[PDB]
Amino acid sequence: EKVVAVIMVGGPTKGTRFRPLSFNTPKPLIPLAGQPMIHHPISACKKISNLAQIFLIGFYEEREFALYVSSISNELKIPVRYLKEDKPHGSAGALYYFRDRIMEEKPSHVFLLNCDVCCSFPLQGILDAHRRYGGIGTVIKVSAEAASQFGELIADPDTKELLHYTEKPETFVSDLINCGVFTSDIFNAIEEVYSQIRFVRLDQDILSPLAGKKQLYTNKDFWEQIKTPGKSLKCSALYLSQFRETSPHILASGDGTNRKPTIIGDVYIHPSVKLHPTAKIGPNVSISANVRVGPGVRLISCIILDDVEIKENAVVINSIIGWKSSIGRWSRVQASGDYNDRLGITILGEAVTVEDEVAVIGSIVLQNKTLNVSVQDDIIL
Amino acid sequence: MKALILVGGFGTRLRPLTLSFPKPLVDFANKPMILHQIEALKAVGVDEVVLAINYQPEVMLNFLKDFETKLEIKITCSQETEPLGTAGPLALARDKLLDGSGEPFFVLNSDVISEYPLKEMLEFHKSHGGEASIMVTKVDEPSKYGVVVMEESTGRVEKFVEKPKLYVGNKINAGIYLLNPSVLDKIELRPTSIEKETFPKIAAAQGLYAMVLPGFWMDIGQPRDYITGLRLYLDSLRKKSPAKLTSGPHIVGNVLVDETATIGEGCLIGPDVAIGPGCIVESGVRLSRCTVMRGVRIKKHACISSSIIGWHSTVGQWARIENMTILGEDVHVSDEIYSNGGVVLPHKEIKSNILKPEIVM
Numbered sequence: 001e002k003v004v005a006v007i008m009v010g011g012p013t014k015g016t017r018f019r020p021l022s023f024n025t026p027k028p029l030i031p032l033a034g035q036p037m038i039h040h041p042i043s044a045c046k047k048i049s050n051l052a053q054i055f056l057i058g059f060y061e062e063r064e065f066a067l068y069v070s071s072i073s074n075e076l077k078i079p080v081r082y083l084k085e086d087k088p089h090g091s092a093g094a095l096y097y098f099r100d101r102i103m104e105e106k107p108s109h110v111f112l113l114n115c116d117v118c119c120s121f122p123l124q125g126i127l128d129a130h131r132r133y134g135g136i137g138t139v140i141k142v143s144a145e146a147a148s149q150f151g152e153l154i155a156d157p158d159t160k161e162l163l164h165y166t167e168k169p170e171t172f173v174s175d176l177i178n179c180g181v182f183t184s185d186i187f188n189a190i191e192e193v194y195s196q197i198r199f200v201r202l203d204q205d206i207l208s209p210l211a212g213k214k215q216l217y218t219n220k221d222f223w224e225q226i227k228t229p230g231k232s233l234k235c236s237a238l239y240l241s242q243f244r245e246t247s248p249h250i251l252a253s254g255d256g257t258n259r260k261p262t263i264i265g266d267v268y269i270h271p272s273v274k275l276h277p278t279a280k281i282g283p284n285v286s287i288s289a290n291v292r293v294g295p296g297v298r299l300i301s302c303i304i305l306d307d308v309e310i311k312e313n314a315v316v317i318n319s320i321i322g323w324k325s326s327i328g329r330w331s332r333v334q335a336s337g338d339y340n341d342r343l344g345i346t347i348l349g350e351a352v353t354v355e356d357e358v359a360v361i362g363s364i365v366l367q368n369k370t371l372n373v374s375v376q377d378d379i380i381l
Numbered sequence: 382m383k384a385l386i387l388v389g390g391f392g393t394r395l396r397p398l399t400l401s402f403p404k405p406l407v408d409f410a411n412k413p414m415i416l417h418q419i420e421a422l423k424a425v426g427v428d429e430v431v432l433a434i435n436y437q438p439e440v441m442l443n444f445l446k447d448f449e450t451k452l453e454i455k456i457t458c459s460q461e462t463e464p465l466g467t468a469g470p471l472a473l474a475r476d477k478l479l480d481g482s483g484e485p486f487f488v489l490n491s492d493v494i495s496e497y498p499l500k501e502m503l504e505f506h507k508s509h510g511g512e513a514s515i516m517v518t519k520v521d522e523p524s525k526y527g528v529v530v531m532e533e534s535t536g537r538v539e540k541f542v543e544k545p546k547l548y549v550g551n552k553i554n555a556g557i558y559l560l561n562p563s564v565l566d567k568i569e570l571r572p573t574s575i576e577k578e579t580f581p582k583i584a585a586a587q588g589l590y591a592m593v594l595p596g597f598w599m600d601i602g603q604p605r606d607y608i609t610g611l612r613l614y615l616d617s618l619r620k621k622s623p624a625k626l627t628s629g630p631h632i633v634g635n636v637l638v639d640e641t642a643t644i645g646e647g648c649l650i651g652p653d654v655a656i657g658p659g660c661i662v663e664s665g666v667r668l669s670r671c672t673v674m675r676g677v678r679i680k681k682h683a684c685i686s687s688s689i690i691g692w693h694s695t696v697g698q699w700a701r702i703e704n705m706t707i708l709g710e711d712v713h714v715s716d717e718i719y720s721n722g723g724v725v726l727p728h729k730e731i732k733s734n735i736l737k738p739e740i741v742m
Contacts, residue, residue: 012728019726019742364742366400369393379740381396381724 004107009058020349033239044121091202114180118235120221135215230345328356397709421497429455433470465572490556496596514559526553
């Protein structure tokens with residue numbers, strides 16, 4: 001057989017929540033646990049030996065993605081390609097558009113996953129489960145109280161077949177929810193709703209009608225929807241935990257002072273960083289390239305982007321420091337850590353200069369901004 | 382004759398209007414703020430004008446290139462690595478100001494608006510033969526500003542009294558200067574504030590003089606000052622040229638409408654409303670104390686009062702905008718949406734009410 005992969009990207013109207021960071025780098029390219037957001041789905045596509053071409057679709061500008069795609073294929077050796085849907089049709093119409101380019105090598109099964117998804121990605125397990133189930137296409141157990149986020153989803157556990165599906169009107173649920181792989185026959189199903197029935201949403205007029213018909217089938221790990229810039233930390237720890245279960249040597253594990261700082265588990269340190277052994281790099285911190293880390297600084301539950309300057313005795317808690325940002329000496333950037341509150345994770349824009357002793361507690365600072373005074377519980381433009 | 386205009390940075394305190402276009406390129410009463418005093422420099426026949434910016438001019442080269450032919454004026458930029466105080470940027474642009482004739486040049490601040498009587502200031506300079514000239518405006522609050530203690534007989538200044546607890550005067554600087562070429566040598570290479578170090582150097586020499594500004598003065602350092610500063614401008618327009626302000630049965634007070642802007646029927650516009658070019662105003666609207674920039678279309682039955690509308694935005698039908706609501710470029714307000722002081726970022730669709738002051742991203 002042959003397998004192809006298509007990843008949804010979205011345009012500048014979806015990353016309208018990551019605004020401070022979206023202005024410099026679009027949502028899919030924002031580094032999660034050191035690597036861009038879509039860099040984890042692409043990493044899981046290589047484990048399928050029968051996979052070939054990869055397709056990134058979305059109404060972004062190709063100029064931004066052309067530079068990034070050129071570097072991925074140098075690592076995993078997979079043909080990745082970006083296609084800009086000039087006419088965005090949500091999801092279903094998005095992929096029916098240029099269906100020729102996707103089915104160009106006659107792939108048996110086509111992978112379809114979304115950008116803002118943080119699961120374990122068992123692509124090789126679901127592929128073989130779909131080969132056994134058959135049908136056109138192919139969940140995670142959550143509490144029944146956690147039902148406002150999605151709604152209702154019914155699946156008979158004997159054949160693992162979706163018996164009923166309502167997107168938002170739940171009206172009694174079954175504790176199962178979507179997570180975000182079909183056969184080659186999926187393009188014909190869209191023609192029977194775009195040409196026969198005639199802006200088409202995949203999870204409204206394709207998933208819901210295919211209920212009784214035995215064609216739609218059905219994680220055992222983690223999953224967290226990440227449309228919020230604050231969720232970029234809670235999910236980053238799971239990826240680091242995934243990099244702490246598998247291959248930890250890619251994760252910094254200093255645990256001492258032999259010119260290596262005090263690392264307190266679940267830390268990814270880029271080799272291009274500058275460190276001081278007196279700094280304590282606590283849990284759940286992902287440091288990017290070409291950053292200068294000061295002495296005696298405390299970094300927990302935060303992610304730091306490129307070209308950041310951390311000065312003497314700085315403290316960073318539940319924060320996201322933008323690009324080329326400057327953190328003054330004895331300055332503190334903390335937040336509560338509430339992934340449900342808007343100001344639970346303080347976010348700093350690009351090239352934001354927090355002066356010495358200046359404190360930022362649970363606030364959002366825009367790019368190219370200077371701070372001489374301490375702020376608290378606000379949104380600074 | 383030469384001239385120099387102090388711009389400063391990008392306009393950080395004027396966001397979200399300066400998030401895209403720099404500070405001097407924001408349309409104020411239809412025209413960008415830079416054109417309000419460049420055309421005034423053409424009234425005195427100034428050919429070349431330099432801008433003491435601090436950011437990179439690469440973003441506004443196309444705009445300044447379009448004003449050189451329309452206005453017949455030479456426009457060149459100067460970018461400093463750091464803005465050296467208040468008099469520093471003048472030390473760098475001294476080469477573009479000396480033509481050889483040794484004529485006084487003007488120094489203007491981009492954060493000030495006035496009536497600009499530049500013609501009758503040269504006669505105020507070519508009468509007593511002074512060396513340096515500044516403009517001075519009366520303020521009701523002299524403590525919050527730096528007071529200039531001059532004599533009420535000739536116009537000579539003596540000392541600088543900042544925050545006077547007792548009354549020593551009420552006259553403050555207006556940000557507009559008139560300097561001979563013989564002053565560009567008294568500055569040092571170190572960042573010096575012209576208000577704190579350079580001006581007292583010439584005041585003790587008694588080689589300067591002062592003139593009073595017979596007009597309005599406003600320091601625009603925040604986006605909410607555009608609705609009240611537009612009042613002082615349109616008021617002076619009722620005096621200078623009253624035929625430049627539109628009139629009609631649906632017009633109340635002072636309204637500045639563009640020839641390109643189109644207004645529907647059954648509307649009510651005023652007072653102090655400025656509609657940029659390329660706009661599309663639908664019927665049943667009620668504008669008051671607001672300013673509308675280019676290309677934005679306001680749908681039918683909308684009520685906007687004391688607000689600021691960005692470029693190429695869209696106000697839905699029956700939408701109510703009030704209380705210093707600040708909208709960025711390309712913001713789409715749905716129908717029936719209420720905003721009570723919502724400072725919104727550009728490229729945002731508003732489908733919910735901003736019933737209280739709130740910053741939307």
